[PDB]
Design a protein around this ligand. Sequence first.
Ligand SMILES: N#Cc1ccc(CN(Cc2nnc(N)o2)C(=O)CSc2ccccc2Cl)cc1
Ligand SMILES: N#Cc1ccc(CN(Cc2nnc(N)o2)C(=O)CSc2ccccc2Cl)cc1
Ligand SMILES: N#Cc1ccc(CN(Cc2nnc(N)o2)C(=O)CSc2ccccc2Cl)cc1
Ligand SMILES: [Cl-]
Ligand SMILES: [Cl-]
Ligand SMILES: [Cl-]
Ligand SMILES: [Cl-]
Ligand SMILES: [Cl-]
Ligand SMILES: [Cl-]
Lengths: 253, 254, 258
Amino acid sequence: SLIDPRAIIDPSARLAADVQVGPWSIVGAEVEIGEGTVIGPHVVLKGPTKIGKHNRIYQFSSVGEDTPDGEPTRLVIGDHNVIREGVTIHRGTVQDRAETTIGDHNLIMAYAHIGHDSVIGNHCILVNNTALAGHVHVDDWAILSGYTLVHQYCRIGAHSFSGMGSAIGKDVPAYVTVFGNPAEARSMNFEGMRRRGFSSEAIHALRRAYKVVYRQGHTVEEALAELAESAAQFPEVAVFRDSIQSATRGITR
Amino acid sequence: MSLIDPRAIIDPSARLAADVQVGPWSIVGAEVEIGEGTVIGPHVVLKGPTKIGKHNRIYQFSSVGEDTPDGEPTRLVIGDHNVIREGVTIHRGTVQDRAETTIGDHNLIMAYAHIGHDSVIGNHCILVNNTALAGHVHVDDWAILSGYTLVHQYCRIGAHSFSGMGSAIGKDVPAYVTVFGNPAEARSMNFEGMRRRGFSSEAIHALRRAYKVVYRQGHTVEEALAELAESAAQFPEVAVFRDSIQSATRGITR
Amino acid sequence: MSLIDPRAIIDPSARLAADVQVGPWSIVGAEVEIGEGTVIGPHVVLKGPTKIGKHNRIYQFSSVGEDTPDLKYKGEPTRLVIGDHNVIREGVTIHRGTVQDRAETTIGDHNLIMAYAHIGHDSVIGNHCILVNNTALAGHVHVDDWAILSGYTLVHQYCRIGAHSFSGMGSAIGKDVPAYVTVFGNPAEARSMNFEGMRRRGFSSEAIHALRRAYKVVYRQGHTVEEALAELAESAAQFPEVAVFRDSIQSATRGITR
Ligand SMILES: N#Cc1ccc(CN(Cc2nnc(N)o2)C(=O)CSc2ccccc2Cl)cc1
Ligand SMILES: N#Cc1ccc(CN(Cc2nnc(N)o2)C(=O)CSc2ccccc2Cl)cc1
Ligand SMILES: N#Cc1ccc(CN(Cc2nnc(N)o2)C(=O)CSc2ccccc2Cl)cc1
Ligand SMILES: [Cl-]
Ligand SMILES: [Cl-]
Ligand SMILES: [Cl-]
Ligand SMILES: [Cl-]
Ligand SMILES: [Cl-]
Ligand SMILES: [Cl-]
């Protein structure tokens, strides 16, 4: 039996035929689970929530809860995600998007917290006890090391990196490496660029870009103007320029 | 359908008010008392001697009323209208201290927060995710401890005080004071909280002056306490600030 | 009052000593071996290949013996070995090793692993250690005997935590911690030595005196690690405790916490 007889499946929950649900797990009202998803034992799923295909949800996780902070609120999870033990994921709020969104191929490790209205892209890694306070946007390939704490409304750029125990209060531009409490910009995620097979011309253009923004005494407005030529030439320097441009809380330094 | 789920384990000695709800696979241990309107979620472990009041809400994977990992009976007393989120750990007292861990009313204890043995939480406190109270910690009314605040043993957290995220508090936090970092450092006062509480402009103004007296005028704790005496008799809110510095045994956060 | 609760799941490949206690809604997975006098609480997940020794106590919501989620691991027959008289509190996560290292996570005897602590792949814990609430060992972390890691201590991969060392609450350890050294903050900084622990253990005043002197040689006299190790050589020959300290600086591959 794919659905263990000790599991609780709410009559309003919609499941694909091959979904697996472990013992003592609760698939609450308005939960939707897609093809090939494996729900481990002792899992609490609450809705309105959509869980896509080939996901893996480990024991003691509480996914789709109401934020502790009849309003129609939602949580949407994509495909091929791994949600480890004790992870807490809250649904969105009417006083925003009404949605917490998680894309594809993400790895959300033990006791990580995804606050209401957060948006996670694809291929992200949120290491043990990473906490997103709420309204946090995490772009593609970002890595947040163990116990990274993220202030509300913060944007974590594409391929960015945070060291363990970092406390992020400002936006992290794309590819930037950040460390400490409060978080400070240190360098670019060159190891990340190598894993993805970026060209030597692109890696050099990104190293040049970091210096314009952080190591040349330029203001945000001064740096953005100087980056315009490199961003037009390289689509990845454009990813860097855009994350600085769209920063609301200022950039991490 | 049934208020007490048939899959839950309820010890014969536990005392539950008629309308108490217990979710599936929860354990309500011996000598655990639960008051009217309380909702115990699924997968909850409740150990005693413990008294839980009225209209509380306890979420899944919480362990409430456990013995300390660090024999006369030791209690855990929880008040009314509290919210205890998932994976919260609350230990009972130790006979060598007060033999009781106490939590008042209208508290919000968020996911994975830890309340060490012999800790006392007042009313209307917010303990954000993973806040940890090492033991013998006193948290006075309306305190806000942001995500992952670590509080050293025997520390006192003043009324209406605030800690920033990831704060590591080794010293007493006076009432109203905002603390940040590891190690925690005093920054200002939570004037925002005062206004939400309906404090008068005059009370707020006297507290602002009280902060300056303690932290920005080079006074010793003794000189500061004598200078605050006058304003403290005029305003009960300044007497609260002055009393928290007077009661400091680990010194104040600077 | 059956020792194995009827609501618990015992895989038929699991090997248990006859007096093993297993609480309701606990899972004793495939290839899990449990020794005499061990008590498994309710709501515990045990996965293998795992050996759990004698007189252990494993609390509710713990996940012991899982695979590391780390992208480098690929379903290998890796192990977790836990010794005797250990206490694993509620919500603790312990992962098995990886073939890329020595394919084993090892925990010795008389350890206290407090609530929500994390023991990453290929970590080695000795004896009489205390890992306070939410301490996290990223992976390949070696914790020698009698170390105390205070609440929310974070340890970088491959770090070595020396015997009788101490970390303050919220420490972020990125380099090796020599034996007896006390470290605080993010990033961790060396402060002094755990003289309190040395006294509790019954070290002679002569040994304590020579350890205090050894700390100054390494940290307070502006010497290099090579110079410091040559200067400590004779004190190390007369005091096993100084040899323990000297060895921890010798074996440091990530540099020592300064
Ligand atoms: N898949 C993967 C993956 C990728 C990057 C990281 C980032 N990273 C370094 C690292 N790389 N491999 C490991 N195990 O750790 C940390 O977060 C260390 S801190 C930590 C680590 C684990 C647990 C608790 C804590 Cl506190 C971590 C895992
Ligand atoms: N009810 C409430 C309430 C009141 C004050 C706070 C204080 N606060 C800022 C904030 N306000 N609303 C939200 N969600 O966060 C934090 O603790 C941020 S850190 C954090 C936040 C949430 C989770 C994990 C972490 Cl680490 C938080 C919640
Ligand atoms: N058995 C034991 C034992 C030995 C040393 C320690 C080291 N220690 C000081 C201390 N001693 N007794 C208590 N309760 O705390 C801390 O880790 C403080 S931080 C903390 C503490 C507890 C929970 C969460 C946090 Cl964050 C802790 C426990
Ligand atoms: Cl066998
Ligand atoms: Cl054995
Ligand atoms: Cl990676
Ligand atoms: Cl514990
Ligand atoms: Cl400490
Ligand atoms: Cl001493």
